[PDB]
Amino acid sequence: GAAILPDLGTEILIPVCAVIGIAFALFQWLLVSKVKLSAVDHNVVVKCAEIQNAISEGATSFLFTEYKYVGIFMVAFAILIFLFLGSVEGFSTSPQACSYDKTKTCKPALATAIFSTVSFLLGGVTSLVSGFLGMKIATYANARTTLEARKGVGKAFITAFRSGAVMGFLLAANGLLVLYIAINLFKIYYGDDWGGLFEAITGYGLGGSSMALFGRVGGGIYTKAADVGADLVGKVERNIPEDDPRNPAVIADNVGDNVGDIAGMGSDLFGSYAESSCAALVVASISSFGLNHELTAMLYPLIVSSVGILVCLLTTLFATDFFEIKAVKEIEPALKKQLVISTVLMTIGVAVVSFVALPTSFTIFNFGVQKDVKSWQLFLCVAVGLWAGLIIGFVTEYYTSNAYSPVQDVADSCRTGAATNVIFGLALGYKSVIIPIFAIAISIFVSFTFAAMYGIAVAALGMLSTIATGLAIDAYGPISDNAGGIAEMAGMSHRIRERTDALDAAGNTTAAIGKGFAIGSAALVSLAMFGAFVSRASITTVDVLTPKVFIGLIVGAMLPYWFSAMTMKSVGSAALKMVEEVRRQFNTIPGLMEGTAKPDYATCVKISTDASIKEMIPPGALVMLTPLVVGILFGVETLSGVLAGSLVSGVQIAISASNTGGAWDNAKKYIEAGASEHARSLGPKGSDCHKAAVIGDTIGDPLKDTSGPSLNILIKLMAVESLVFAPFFATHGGLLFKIF
Amino acid sequence: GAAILPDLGTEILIPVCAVIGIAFALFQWLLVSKVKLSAVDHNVVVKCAEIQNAISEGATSFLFTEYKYVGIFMVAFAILIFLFLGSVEGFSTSPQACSYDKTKTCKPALATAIFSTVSFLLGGVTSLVSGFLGMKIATYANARTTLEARKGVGKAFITAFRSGAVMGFLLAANGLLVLYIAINLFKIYYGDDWGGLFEAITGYGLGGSSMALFGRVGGGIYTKAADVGADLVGKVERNIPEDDPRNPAVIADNVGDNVGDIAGMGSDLFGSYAESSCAALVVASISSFGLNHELTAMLYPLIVSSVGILVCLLTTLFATDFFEIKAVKEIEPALKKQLVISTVLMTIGVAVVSFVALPTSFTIFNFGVQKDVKSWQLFLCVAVGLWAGLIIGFVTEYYTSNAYSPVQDVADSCRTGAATNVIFGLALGYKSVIIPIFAIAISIFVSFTFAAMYGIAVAALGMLSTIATGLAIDAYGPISDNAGGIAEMAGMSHRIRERTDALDAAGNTTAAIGKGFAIGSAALVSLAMFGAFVSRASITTVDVLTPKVFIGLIVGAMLPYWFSAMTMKSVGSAALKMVEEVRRQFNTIPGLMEGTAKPDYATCVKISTDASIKEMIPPGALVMLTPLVVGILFGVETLSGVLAGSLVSGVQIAISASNTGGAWDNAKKYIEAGASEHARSLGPKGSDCHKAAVIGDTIGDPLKDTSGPSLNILIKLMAVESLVFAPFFATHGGLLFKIF
Ligand SMILES: [K+]
Ligand SMILES: [K+]
Ligand SMILES: [Mg+2]
Ligand SMILES: [Mg+2]
Ligand SMILES: [Mg+2]
Ligand SMILES: [Mg+2]
Ligand SMILES: [Mg+2]
Ligand SMILES: [Mg+2]
Ligand SMILES: [Mg+2]
Ligand SMILES: [Mg+2]
Ligand SMILES: [Mg+2]
Ligand SMILES: [Mg+2]
């Protein structure tokens, strides 16, 4: 039948919560604004703002340049969507048989091509708008976090997390509202044809990850080229401190945090939210929910998202108001509490949403067959994905925090040089993948068993049902990182930079956890999409042991390595040029090393700007062209193979790269902090140990900030892309097999 | 029906070719024995012979320790095979109906439990013998190659390559002869039941790879703990030549080339020969050849191998006689011409074999159905594998030879630190996987389409039909390594080490090529055995989109990383110990650095012995217990996922590990040789560049020598294990799903 919550209640609840979310984000922005500063001790406060503006400008300058290219591609690709999807029915204007029920009549395919194009641009534009906001808050709160470190750790933490929360809640509340609006607009046209409505809607997730792919890779290349170049000439060669205003690469470095770690990461996670929702929507759309036009249950994913915002609001209070940090050793435990608190609160929240927004019995589309499903079983589906994420977080903290043996052993290995650091870090990351895969596998079993592709898609949404807290703890990191850079560039005391270093180290672990959630839910949503693709393409069986499927499987598995090779070599070449420029200045600019002369910052921003824009194109092309090339030339069976192989394979290298990189970084931080006998034993800064740690750190740079986190996008992009173009592929694809 | 070559002919041809192969091997050993030496300039001949005996005593000593444990595991596991296989039919002795033809009576499953246990023992013993014979010729030729370098590269090349050819021809002939003997012996029992005869024979490949896994990993840890320790302290820290006799780790280092690179590699490759032949034989046994009891066609793979021995003998003469080398740039193109001549000669050879050993039409078992296949279609299956090999060879060379831009840019990247060197090598390896994958996929498609699992098994055998030559160019490598090691320890002329350094660099490429052939054919044979497993397990369909299969798939893709984490951490830990020990002697033994006092070589041998023997157990357990654990607990459908997933995933990390390690090695070799302006400007030895190169090389050491080459064994091993245990898993498996 129907549920306790009436459709009208759902129609109110969803945007009410979105607006509560947007409201809450503006509140925290206002609080952060209470910290005053301007560029026209008090003398520090002007240097801090003079610096913030250098970064703010540089960040903005890059994103605008990046957006110019990405928006053009967005428009070109939106045309490809219209053409290809429009061509299935010969661009007819008449209705046809429903793909999901020949007895019924649907809206014309050509209408769906148009709405798929529309939802795509919606998603593309919402994606670019996601990273840009996050950059604005990050570049607003960075210097404000510096200044508040003149009052202790706990105060600086607060403004960084408040600001992290601003990014998290704006992104979460705005992605939900745009979807909700899109759905309801689209509905005026589609009427009773919900199947085609949400099939149109799925372009939203395609729009998101498409633009996110270029943000993560483009921003990733900008930031890490500067990162390696600055750190190498500065710390390893000239023995000057990290983030030293003498170093001409420090602006690009700190611009880079916002441009990649914030902007790219923001878009990245939006794509995760959107795909997850869309996936749950397309499967529900042709299940009992959509066939019986029951709006509430249909919009179950958005309802879960809405309560999610509320829960995270309550949670955030525990760190921003209810509690104060006194000891550096409290920072990480504080951040982790957010995960634990919200996971527990949300377990209750989903129980409630399940109990009032679902019928006790319904059906779920199951490869041609309605499957009998109980609401307590959907409860377990979203719950298993929610807990899988907490587990993933806990494991990721274990392998990347310097408060535990794995990372401490790695710092230790510096006693014998960079070579043993690199060897220990590689092995650490390979080691780190075990439990996450297991968490994911359990998630898949539990969710697949209960509710087919819907359960999986809803388990993915489950893992991202706390997306606002997740983003907040993550965005806090690059905000903290920028803060310690403003400290060192304004020549503030040793006491200041020690506090930001404690915050930054926590944000390193935070960033790996985000990377983990991104990878965990990507694996889930991609499987759901893979399944929905197989159905929509009218494949009977994806039989592993057939030539078309296997060559697909083995080639698809090779894809994330190819992508890695591009992006790694990309940073490797750009970083090589950066080293040469920093040297050129330290060697040919008189008085520079002395501290009397000014470094040419712009040259370093130009080097990493030139490299990122030229070199984001091939890996993007690789990921967008593959579904099309394989789908057109080889056919849906093969594209099925490519979808399975790139999922199972790309996940191992994504987890291991991000963790290895995170580890080398925090090992390096450990030595630099000297907060224990062992830590001090490997120092001081400048030591042979410390330098080995820096070598390891800078190899981890592209691994965890360019190639690593982007690999989760490669997977989930190719998956929607395949789902969206499925009708085209099944009709007009397979060419090499037809013409022979 | 019958073919041009009568059953009796085939019975004669095969062992005659094994005997011809064994005679060739002995002949070369004889010629190499002409280089006379002994430990009773003249001092320089004497010093070489004392160094040779340190190494020989060392390598013989270790393998015996290793074989003690491996041999014990071999016996334990044979018991498990007997128990688990015999338990299928309640250890009954009553004959039952042939599952391939119910009108016939077959030998009891108990008989197959016994004969599987026997073939496993044969296989593991042969594997043990293969690696031992390899070490023995290597530890004989090593110093003879040193003395011959006094007369120049060409003469030295000859005795190193003649020697590699000794190992190659023995291993190939003895491997073929054993399999041939086993088949005929078993037939006395099975009579007309060739289904079960050849199902018994499949244990041979299982025993072969089982022992190889331990050989490869044990020897791998031994040698790379030494290598990394020696190089880092000696070259990077104490500024002394590589392989300096003052360095305490040098004897272990050189022992290790014989113990991993030779014994482990030899065993590894034998496993590939046994498995590929075994897979071809099982599918044939329940196809028209086995069912119609046609011996010649049934033994088609052993005939291909017989003709391969002959073809390789002729090919060998081109490098051994018909041409001498006069310049260093002629070394690599000679080794490559071995590949090219053998490939061309074997295409003819296989056309001939296919013309006279097969009837023009026959059927091949294809998942229940007899599939109509023609003899020229089988020609293409082995030839596509054969040609895929050569392609893999050319591409691997382009990526690991310092005569090309990939490695030279890597050497060049040293100019900016160890960090950039590592980033370039990591990127290089990721880049390298692409074409071999395509070669493999094309191989799979062509062979899969034409003759299902038999075609694939025969493509694998195709890739390895030139196994004598393949081994010869490979085993040549560690022999050239020892030669330069002996040269440095004997304080011989610099002109001597310049020559061996040219030989050694060639063998670095050759080693990567050998790695590629092993990986390429591992993927082929594993897919063949996957499909055979599926029939044997009575699986109707491996559908990727089931909960049971998918979880297997994603977990299976993770195994290759779990394995890499273990092996990497092991070498990393043992190397750390080695460095400490080497430092201790340099820092505390008076006279050592000054060449007055003698270092202690035994402590270094003891550290690498202690670590290899202990730490080879867990990764061996992971590989061998996985099929048993997943099979018993989850069932055959989940095991299916694990096989697909570990194949497509392991193959990528194996390729990139091996090539990255190869790249770094030859990069530093390029700097060490300064044979162009570019190379010279990165020098001289000891420069900041050289030391970045050395770091990279040492990170590469475990990647290409412990972890990398073993992954191919993980892959192909979990496949025969599953095929062999399929009846046990089908019947008594999937407990978790039965108790719920
Ligand atoms: K960070
Ligand atoms: K070698
Ligand atoms: Mg840095
Ligand atoms: Mg940064
Ligand atoms: Mg920084
Ligand atoms: Mg960091
Ligand atoms: Mg960094
Ligand atoms: Mg070495
Ligand atoms: Mg060696
Ligand atoms: Mg050597
Ligand atoms: Mg070498
Ligand atoms: Mg080495």
UniProtKB/Swiss-Prot annotation, chains A, B:
The keyword Cell inner membrane does not apply. Keywords: Disulfide bond, Hydrogen ion transport, Ion transport, Magnesium, Membrane, Metal-binding, Translocase, Transmembrane, Transmembrane helix, Transport, Vacuole. Residues 1-7, 89-109, 191-193, 287-294, 357-375, 447-452, 538-547, 635, 733-739 are intravacuolar. Mg(2+) 3 binds at D257, D481. Substrate binds at K224, K704. It is found in: Vacuole membrane. The chain crosses the membrane at residues 8-34, 59-88, 110-137, 161-190, 194-222, 261-286, 295-320, 329-356, 376-399, 422-446, 453-479, 509-537, 548-576, 606-634, 636-663, 707-732. It is a multi-pass membrane protein. Its main location: membrane. GO terms for molecular function: diphosphate hydrolysis-driven proton transmembrane transporter activity; inorganic diphosphate phosphatase activity; metal ion binding. It comes from the Eukaryota. GO terms for cellular component: vacuolar membrane. Changing K716 to A/R/M: Reduces pyrophosphatase activity by over 90%. Abolishes proton transport. The keyword Translocase applies. Residues 138-160, 223-260, 321-328, 400-421, 480-508, 577-605, 664-706 are cytoplasmic. Its EC number is 7.1.3.1. Pfam families: H_PPase. PANTHER family: K(+)-INSENSITIVE PYROPHOSPHATE-ENERGIZED PROTON PUMP. Proton-translocating inorganic pyrophosphatase that contributes to the transtonoplast (from cytosol to vacuole lumen) H(+)-electrochemical potential difference. It establishes a proton gradient of similar and often greater magnitude than the H(+)-ATPase on the same membrane. Has 16 transmembrane helices and a large cytoplasmic domain that contains the active site. Homodimer. Belongs to the H(+)-translocating pyrophosphatase (TC 3.A.10) family. K(+)-stimulated subfamily. Has few direct interactions with pyrophosphate. Interacts with the substrate via divalent metal cations, such as magnesium ions, that are bound to the pyrophosphate. HAMAP family: PPase_energized_pump (MF_01129). This is Pyrophosphate-energized vacuolar membrane proton pump.
